[PDB]
Amino acid sequence: IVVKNNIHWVGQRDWEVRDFHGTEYKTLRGSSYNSYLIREEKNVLIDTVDHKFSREFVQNLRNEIDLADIDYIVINHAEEDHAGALTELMAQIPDTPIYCTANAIDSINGHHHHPEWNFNVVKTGDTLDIGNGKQLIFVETPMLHWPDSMMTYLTGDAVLFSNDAFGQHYCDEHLFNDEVDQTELFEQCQRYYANILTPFSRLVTPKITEILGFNLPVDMIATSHGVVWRDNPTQIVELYLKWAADYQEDRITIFYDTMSNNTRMMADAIAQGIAETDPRVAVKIFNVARSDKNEILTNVFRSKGVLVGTSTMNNVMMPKIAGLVEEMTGLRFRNKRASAFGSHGWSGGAVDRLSTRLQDAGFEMSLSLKAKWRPDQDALKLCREHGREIARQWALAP
Amino acid sequence: IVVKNNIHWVGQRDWEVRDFHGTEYKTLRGSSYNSYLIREEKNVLIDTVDHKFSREFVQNLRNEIDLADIDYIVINHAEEDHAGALTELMAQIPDTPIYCTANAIDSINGHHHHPEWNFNVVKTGDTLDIGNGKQLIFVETPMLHWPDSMMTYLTGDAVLFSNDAFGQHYCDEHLFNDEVDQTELFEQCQRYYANILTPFSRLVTPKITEILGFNLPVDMIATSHGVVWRDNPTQIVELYLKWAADYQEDRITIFYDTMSNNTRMMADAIAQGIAETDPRVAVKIFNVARSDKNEILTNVFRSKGVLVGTSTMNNVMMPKIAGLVEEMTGLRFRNKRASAFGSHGWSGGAVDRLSTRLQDAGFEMSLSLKAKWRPDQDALKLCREHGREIARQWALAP
Amino acid sequence: IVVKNNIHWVGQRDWEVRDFHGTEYKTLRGSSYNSYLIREEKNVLIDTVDHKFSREFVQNLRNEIDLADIDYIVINHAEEDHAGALTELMAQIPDTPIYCTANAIDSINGHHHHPEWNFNVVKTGDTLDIGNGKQLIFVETPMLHWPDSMMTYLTGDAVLFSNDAFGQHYCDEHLFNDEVDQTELFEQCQRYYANILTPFSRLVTPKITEILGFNLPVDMIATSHGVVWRDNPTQIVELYLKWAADYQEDRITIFYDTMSNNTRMMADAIAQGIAETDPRVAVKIFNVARSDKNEILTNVFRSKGVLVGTSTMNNVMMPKIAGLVEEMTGLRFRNKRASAFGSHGWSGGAVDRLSTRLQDAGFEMSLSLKAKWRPDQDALKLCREHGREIARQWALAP
Amino acid sequence: IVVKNNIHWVGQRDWEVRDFHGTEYKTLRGSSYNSYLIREEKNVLIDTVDHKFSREFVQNLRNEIDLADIDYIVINHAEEDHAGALTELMAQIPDTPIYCTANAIDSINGHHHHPEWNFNVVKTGDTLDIGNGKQLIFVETPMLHWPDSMMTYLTGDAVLFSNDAFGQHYCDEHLFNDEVDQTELFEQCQRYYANILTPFSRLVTPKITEILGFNLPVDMIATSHGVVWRDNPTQIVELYLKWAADYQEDRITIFYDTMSNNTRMMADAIAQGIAETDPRVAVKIFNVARSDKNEILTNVFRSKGVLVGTSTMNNVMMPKIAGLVEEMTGLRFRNKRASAFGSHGWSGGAVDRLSTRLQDAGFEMSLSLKAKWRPDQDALKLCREHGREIARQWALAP
Ligand SMILES: Cc1cc2nc3c(=O)[nH]c(=O)nc-3n(C[C@H](O)[C@H](O)[C@H](O)COP(=O)(O)O)c2cc1C
Ligand SMILES: Cc1cc2nc3c(=O)[nH]c(=O)nc-3n(C[C@H](O)[C@H](O)[C@H](O)COP(=O)(O)O)c2cc1C
Ligand SMILES: Cc1cc2nc3c(=O)[nH]c(=O)nc-3n(C[C@H](O)[C@H](O)[C@H](O)COP(=O)(O)O)c2cc1C
Ligand SMILES: Cc1cc2nc3c(=O)[nH]c(=O)nc-3n(C[C@H](O)[C@H](O)[C@H](O)COP(=O)(O)O)c2cc1C
Ligand SMILES: [Fe+3]
Ligand SMILES: [Fe+3]
Ligand SMILES: [Fe+3]
Ligand SMILES: [Fe+3]
Ligand SMILES: [Fe+3]
Ligand SMILES: [Fe+3]
Ligand SMILES: [Fe+3]
Ligand SMILES: [Fe+3]
Incomplete structure (x- = not known):
């Protein structure tokens, strides 16, 4: 449940799930939805979980921290599997400011129909101070895989919350990459990229090149699905470059x-x-x-x-x-x-x-x-x- | 097992079957494959059964009559569900003459690869004497539903062996139409026509008009799937005319x-x-x-x-x-x-x-x-x- | 949407649903969840819908009437398919009194965990005035099919809200029994009784005998699943007596x-x-x-x-x-x-x-x-x- | 197709198969059925294939050798997936002697109903000369997994035809163990043992101990399902001992x-x-x-x-x-x-x-x-x- 220091995993494991996008993506090893609570001077919540678990989410979040103590909400991606518990949460703390891309405002409204929410548009390079010498640096990533997609970087702890990217649908009680079965892990990473990210391969290399060009340390990559890349994080990044280059085996x-x-x-x-x-x-x-x-x-x-x-x-x-x-x-x-x-x-x-x-x-x-x-x-x-x-x-x- | 007089049903009921044409036609009430043995002066076999039941077919046919006593074989349709037991049968009585359309020769060979078999091409109006004042009158019906399709009429008994036409996939231990559940019967007749015969509706009215123009009595219509139309046979014929006319309800x-x-x-x-x-x-x-x-x-x-x-x-x-x-x-x-x-x-x-x-x-x-x-x-x-x-x-x- | 006079259907049709009780009851024709809003001097809501449609339910109920105007809530059965939208509703009008059996209090709490709600225990013969000379007469029906089950009778309009009993999982845009396909309707009624009510057949005849012994007119029977029995209501009652008597055909x-x-x-x-x-x-x-x-x-x-x-x-x-x-x-x-x-x-x-x-x-x-x-x-x-x-x-x- | 020297694989790959034993064993990677033709002075056929491929089997066997040239037939196991093409084959060469266990005679007859076939009972240690200084040594293995099961050892080439044992349902165009994907291979070996061989674990160690006690060299282990163990054969044997010992991981x-x-x-x-x-x-x-x-x-x-x-x-x-x-x-x-x-x-x-x-x-x-x-x-x-x-x-x- 504890990722690193004051970063707390507050997501939801889903052992039973088999269908995604209707039945267009079948998940034979279930899945998980990662949500991260960061508590320094400012308490910030990063993404929610699938709409099917909205009740369990809020309740579990209460047992972690009083809702009123949440200062900011970060939404990297407005798809139902990550922002499905947002309405049920915003009903308890309606005044809480949300941070997302301009496109996310369009996609969040298209799902929740609450245009009155305090949205705050962010762009690449934008920062959000959270106290204790740490801040959140945002990185837009449109069409990876949605126009609204972005990533959030946490200074100091060097944690990159990438959302869907670098994720995989593989349900396990252990959180970190070095704790799970390696073969099943990689089989699921490749299955994900091939079925969802293939059409946007051209955007992967330039995007990854840009992020590395920021000269930021990465101790961990915390996706929204599956494990947290703790042990040798660039591992999964090297793979994506490989996969994005019109990949083929014999x-x-x-x-x-x-x-x-x-x-x-x-x-x-x-x-x-x-x-x-x-x-x-x-x-x-x-x-x-x-x-x-x-x-x-x-x-x-x-x-x-x-x-x-x-x-x-x-x-x-x-x-x-x-x-x-x-x-x-x-x-x-x-x-x-x-x-x-x-x-x-x-x-x-x-x-x-x-x-x-x-x-x-x-x-x-x-x-x-x-x-x-x-x-x-x-x-x-x-x-x-x-x-x-x-x-x-x-x-x-x- | 006895249809009428010297006409013997020697087909195969299939309670378990769910898939036809791969999985393009699902049969939720199973099916049956009708084969008819007519014994007058000449013993004639009309169609076989699905290839999956070739062993049971021949054996059951032995218990009915010695194979050598079969004089002629009539093949109305060369699809595997009706001619699948033909190779296993012709291996016992290789010299037996077969009667079919010219196109059937092409389709039978394309399945069984035995061009040496004694084929005998028949056309509309052709007859085949079988003794006792009775004969078989053939009626070509190309593209209903295959180029090789035809029907066989038995004089005297007034039985029309129509094969697929007027049939339905509905497995029951009773053979005759008046013996089964009427609603399930008609639901299956309509399901059949809609999923298989729709593309050839234009050929139905002219064909049925032609057959009636022969002024032949029809006491029974014996299809290759499901029940034998004994009680008010034209019943199913009237329906086909209805269905073929760009049918639609409110x-x-x-x-x-x-x-x-x-x-x-x-x-x-x-x-x-x-x-x-x-x-x-x-x-x-x-x-x-x-x-x-x-x-x-x-x-x-x-x-x-x-x-x-x-x-x-x-x-x-x-x-x-x-x-x-x-x-x-x-x-x-x-x-x-x-x-x-x-x-x-x-x-x-x-x-x-x-x-x-x-x-x-x-x-x-x-x-x-x-x-x-x-x-x-x-x-x-x-x-x-x-x-x-x-x-x-x-x-x-x- | 209008059942009769001031009785408004405010339920939810479910065309897509295939699984009930896990996968123990498959519904091949979908289903529907009936909720009835009665508005006289007192506005009373009878049951909710499946938890999967809680959001659509409340919203649709708003478009019908302001929530604060709801005076009483009647819960005949606390299973998720009928009381699944109760928490989301009670969160808007927490002080609203609920009427149910003693066992329902146990089952509602076991699902929603809100023991503070204003429960009001009712027994057979109990009444609840709603103005305009009309009242609600309650009829306990334990183990039909749950210990908490009951029925509600509306005086004047002569409407019997029976919940599960006399219902069937058959999704249709028309509400009344005389408006749907009769064969599909009855096939679904029988499928329901056989798979769910069989073990409690002994309780059916005595219970139905008791209700009739109240000498109450029944113009309509409004179940919680499927059609409202408007045309010849006792129709379905006669069937249940038939079915409950160790039913068997040849x-x-x-x-x-x-x-x-x-x-x-x-x-x-x-x-x-x-x-x-x-x-x-x-x-x-x-x-x-x-x-x-x-x-x-x-x-x-x-x-x-x-x-x-x-x-x-x-x-x-x-x-x-x-x-x-x-x-x-x-x-x-x-x-x-x-x-x-x-x-x-x-x-x-x-x-x-x-x-x-x-x-x-x-x-x-x-x-x-x-x-x-x-x-x-x-x-x-x-x-x-x-x-x-x-x-x-x-x-x-x- | 060539296993070793004069040993020819003449089996059947099955990419589409998903169901075994009804639906009690699902095979997600398909399967294969191994049949081996050994031609020295005597031509001997070891097992056939699944009954579903009887036609393809005989035909392919013709293209390999004239049927009359087959001297002996060895049947290690009389289950339909290995002896399903036996009737269709024995119909061409009825006089061919068959070698099997006493129990196999009972099981083969129970399937094919041809008690007139020339059966020859073999026991552990029995030999069958095939010329060129090579012979077949038989090893009974009852209840591994059927009462009729046995293994055949080929002298000189040092090939152990073990049938089901050491096999796995994993369809691949390559025949040898070192040619396929190792992880998928072992995942399938373990899946097989656990679902079929578990109840007979007590017999595995004594049996394997007995075979090794014969001091016979094993260059290859040729099962009836999947790959031929060419590279480090004892590999799979060591595993079976491990698995048979009330196996468990943390x-x-x-x-x-x-x-x-x-x-x-x-x-x-x-x-x-x-x-x-x-x-x-x-x-x-x-x-x-x-x-x-x-x-x-x-x-x-x-x-x-x-x-x-x-x-x-x-x-x-x-x-x-x-x-x-x-x-x-x-x-x-x-x-x-x-x-x-x-x-x-x-x-x-x-x-x-x-x-x-x-x-x-x-x-x-x-x-x-x-x-x-x-x-x-x-x-x-x-x-x-x-x-x-x-x-x-x-x-x-x-
Ligand atoms: C995998 C995926 C691919 C999508 N591709 C497009 C697209 O190419 N163009 C577009 O306008 N929307 C695209 N969308 C957005 C969906 O069309 C949008 O969410 C829609 O409202 C979903 O409709 P539905 O829930 O009825 O299936 C995509 C969504 C997903 C999940
Ligand atoms: C329902 C049905 C429709 C068919 N339509 C055509 C057609 O339009 N043109 C054609 O040449 N063959 C048609 N055929 C014949 C098949 O293409 C032919 O039997 C083919 O060899 C089957 O291939 P498959 O067994 O690999 O599916 C049809 C067959 C069926 C059963
Ligand atoms: C069809 C059905 C039959 C039931 N039978 C019993 C029963 O016989 N005894 C009992 O104590 N509870 C019975 N119950 C209640 C369930 O056991 C109870 O709702 C339980 O909490 C459900 O567990 P689950 O959601 O994990 O399946 C029944 C529920 C249903 C839907
Ligand atoms: C996995 C398996 C386990 C079996 N276990 C037994 C057994 O314990 N006792 C027995 O007499 N036969 C056993 N048999 C043999 C079957 O019962 C026998 O083949 C039977 O005729 C098959 O019936 P079915 O084809 O209708 O399923 C077993 C067969 C298989 C495939
Ligand atoms: Fe997404
Ligand atoms: Fe996602
Ligand atoms: Fe056909
Ligand atoms: Fe057919
Ligand atoms: Fe219920
Ligand atoms: Fe219900
Ligand atoms: Fe076996
Ligand atoms: Fe086997």
Whole structure:
């Protein structure tokens, strides 16, 4: 509960949660919502928690400090998972001044509908004295991931409250990074970036470059989700630079949907052709109807190339492929190559429309693979050869 | 097990099945696969069963008749749920002649890869004598629902083996229509047509008109799924004509997806505005992430108008909406009106792209509804008014 | 929104909800939460809504009437789906007197932890004048379904606010029973009683007998879930008497779990043996792993007999069967007969323990059916014969 | 495809599979089925594949070798996932002699119903010459995991075909252990043992001791699921000894079910009390209704102690807890301690029956924790204290 000195974690662990953003981001290891109470000469509260825990939040905050003793409230991000307990709290201390970006005023009002609250706009470099020789330095970070996002730096203790950035949805009773299981931790960090931060990778390097340019010490990075980076904090920062640079491993992801397993047979063959041709490559196969969507996108993120599959259904693609291609267009993956494939009954046409959309999504397209009905021994030889040819074209230098 | 005289049901009931066409058609009441053995002077087998039951099928067929005694095999439709036990059967009696459409030869080979089988092409009006003054009259029905589809008429007994047409996925131990629960039966008939036959409605009336033009008596209609229409057979035929004529009731369906329930609030308000304005209208609301997709499409089929909802996510629609719009484009609903709506955070743009695609799908578009963040009391008044205005524009004549 | 005269519906429709009591009661047609505002000389609020809609509730109540104008609050049932918006409301009007049973004081405090609230204990026959010649007559109904449950009768308008009783989870924009789809309505009424009220059937007839013994007119029955019974109200009352009397139709339900489909094959055979022997009987088969649990229990409720299936796994039953038998023990079905069956590999023992527990649950047991590994043609003949023998033993009089 | 010298992998990768043993074992990374063709002077086939891939299996085996050239068939285990393609294969070469345990004859017949097949019973130490100075030495391993289980040792090449043992459900295009991701590999090995092999741990050490007592070299261990242990084979053997010895880490697992989140609140508090008292302990919390069951059991396996939770529902436990306790009784965990807890409304009684059953399952019981309705601040202090007290009682020596 105690982060460092007079900084107190007053957040909420959520072991049961599985759905975020509707069902667009599934969290298989639950999550946590970090809120930090800093008490020097001035008592300042940094962010709240998910709206589902508003009652537990206020009550727990009472057991920590009398509400009237809170001087300032800092809101880095106005999304419901961080500002959901704000209305219930401001109902007890309505006159308390809030500090946020100009855009946050727009987003906070859009959620809580209380424009009378004492908002105080802050910009990059702005400071807020809190006594004892310590102050809060604000750093705007628009579109990382919302127009309203920012970060708060605490002088002296050298703590960077980054909110969503550098966070991960991984529920644990221990607070610090060196206290949890390392593999599960990093698997969750990468899952987060790939499914939410990918479309804004271009802003990451310049932003991180700017922050470092302030020559500020960082003993800890305290995110709004998961662990506090206490042990070797820049650790997670180095990763974000790596991830933001059109990241890719020697990996190929293959996903598809199928009605009678014909496209599946093509997928399996293509894989065998790849694994047989280039041993360095790690291959993954997924049925979009029977798989975790976020796991597919994480792999895609980690991949140098992708093969998407679909049969023709009513002159169009299959719904789950159409939807998954829509999401990829939004995530805008970069410097990746792709190939479409599928089976059909008579007129077909789904592989062609799938191929065009993959290209508009930003993928560098290779030749498509097409089969009629169920691939017989001859057709399967073609599918394996397609796997080999793809493996040669995409092969990394020796 | 006995249908009529020397016609024996030798199919397979499937109580456990939930998924068809991958997961594109969910069957909540299971299904059945009808195969009919006709024994006069010639023993003829009409269709087989799903590939998953190939072992049980052959064995049960042995207990009915020695395989060598089967003279002819009739294949109306070469989809795996009806011809899946064909390879395992033809391995015992390889020389047995098969009767089907020219397209069926292409589709059967595409599945079983046995081009050596003794195929015999049949066309509309063709006959196959089976002794005792009875014969089989074939009726081609391409694209109902496959290019290979046809129907078989048995003279004397006046039995029409229609295969998929007039069928429904409803598992019951009783075979005849008058023996099962009527409401569940018809609910399943309508669910079938809406999710599979809608795109081919234009072919239904001419086809049914043609068959009736043959002046043939019909004592029974024996489909490949579900009950045998024994009691008042034309019953289901009258329905298909009704359904094929751009069918619609005084009903409005509203579906959407949402990340923080903002679009949900708009949907609820719109509904209240409709119900309050026009009591004749039946309203339905669905969250595509939390609902049965086939149930949504059935309602859409039954509806005169639709309101589709979505928020903006990464400059695009939400995946499940994009996918569901893709499927509707394929099903090609006709003479229906629609309206797009949704919330957004800053730039938006998802409602506009949703509206265009709905139009390209064949919907007559009305004004869109847009809100920013969470709709406050003022915004909610607009959403209800949108419901009222829509209800007036779409209202049926007094 | 207007029920009758000065009685105003101020509840909340819930189209999206699927889970109740964790996941023990799935609601496939959503639900609604009814709250009624009665305004004569005294303004009285009857129940609130689900805690998830506390914000929308208070706000909507403001748009209806100023909170200070509310004189009394009536709480028939203190479960979260009806009293979840009570804390948020009492925070605005803390001095407002509450009327409930003695047990409700215990249950309301156990949820809200505000023992200072002005509680007023009421008993059967107690009245509360509200002006204009009208008063509220209270009727305690403990264990229907909670120790705290009661009903409120409004004189003059003749409205019986029964809360949970006579309700159903069926979300619709129309409020009155004669305005909704009748089949869906009754299907939901029966689903409710079977899954929640079965264990307390013995209390239903005496309670309903008592209420009628008050010689009070009932123009409407306004439940807390779903429609208001406006058209022929006693309709639903007659049903409850029917349902409470160890209800059963000429129906047999068969459910089981299976690892390799051996027990499934036995189930299918048994069914064929039943349907072949006694045509009057309606048969239903369910795989507990692939089916809606509440649908299974509804059928069981409607059934005269049950056949539960399971294979032996690690010397014990299968989990989902063990769990489902645990729930049945709690629901305490009466005057029903049952038979256990299943397959095993070597030592077995699961059918025997399943049979004993079914008996302790209150089922009158018949002979068990046992098979080793996969039932061959001989074993299948035994399984069908078991179906026939069961069908004869349980047959209703001619 | 080539394992070593004249040993050819001819199995089947299954990327899509999610369900095993009905739904009792969920496989989130798919699986594979290993079949090995050994060709010296005698051509011998070791096991087949899952029945779902019988067609692909035979066909692929044809492309490898003419069926008539197969001299012997070895069946280590007669479960459908390894002998499912046996009927379809024996239909082509009916006279081929089969080698298996006496119990396998019983289990193979129970599945395939072909008692005429040329079975040849083998016992531990039995040999089967295959030419070129190499022979097959058989090692019976009853109840690991079936009465029919055995292992086959190939002289010269020093390959131990262990079947299920040492296997894992982890689908990959690479065959050898040193070629796959190590963490995912071991996570799957442990998941397998915990969910299937736990009840037979007592037989593992004596069996492995016996095999090593034969003084046979092992260059490779070729299982029937997943990778071939090529690099440091004894690796997985050392683990099994570790796992079989009533394995436990410094870990505590907490699972429960809940209807209104009361028991959840108790669970969260207990955890906080543990983490606060003993930092060495890793804590895990699961909602049985919202979690992967196999993941829960894996943790339980890894745990020194467990806290199971449940509220009272209809005088009994909650179904999913009852079912999960039934399965644990079957898995028979050893040398673990446990504590029951839960909330109730009036009479309660579920915690007491849960506690007794946990004890009969083999857990050493601690004091139970009980609360009424929703735990207020006082009750929560008790729940945390319960966490502390448990943490002290179960603490490992300094
Ligand atoms: C509902 C349905 C609709 C179909 N629509 C088309 C179509 O529009 N054009 C076409 O060429 N084939 C169509 N087909 C045939 C399939 O594309 C063909 O069977 C294909 O081989 C199946 O591929 P899959 O098993 O990998 O899903 C359709 C099949 C089904 C079941
Ligand atoms: C992951 C994510 C991506 C978003 N992308 C956009 C966007 O590209 N443009 C925009 O205007 N708003 C965007 N938003 C803001 C949402 O559209 C806004 O919060 C909206 O009110 C939510 O609607 P809903 O709760 O009905 O889903 C995004 C929100 C999230 C969570
Ligand atoms: C994981 C597992 C555990 C088993 N445990 C037992 C057992 O304890 N006693 C027994 O006689 N058979 C046992 N069996 C064998 C099964 O009961 C046998 O295969 C049965 O026919 C399967 O029935 P089902 O396919 O209907 O589920 C077990 C099988 C499996 C897969
Ligand atoms: C359907 C149902 C049945 C119940 N049955 C009992 C009961 O038999 N005995 C009892 O003391 N409480 C009973 N209760 C009350 C609950 O046990 C009580 O609300 C408890 O605090 C809920 O715990 P949970 O939210 O953790 O699930 C029942 C509650 C429900 C909803
Ligand atoms: Fe965020
Ligand atoms: Fe966040
Ligand atoms: Fe079809
Ligand atoms: Fe069909
Ligand atoms: Fe209730
Ligand atoms: Fe209720
Ligand atoms: Fe096995
Ligand atoms: Fe196995």
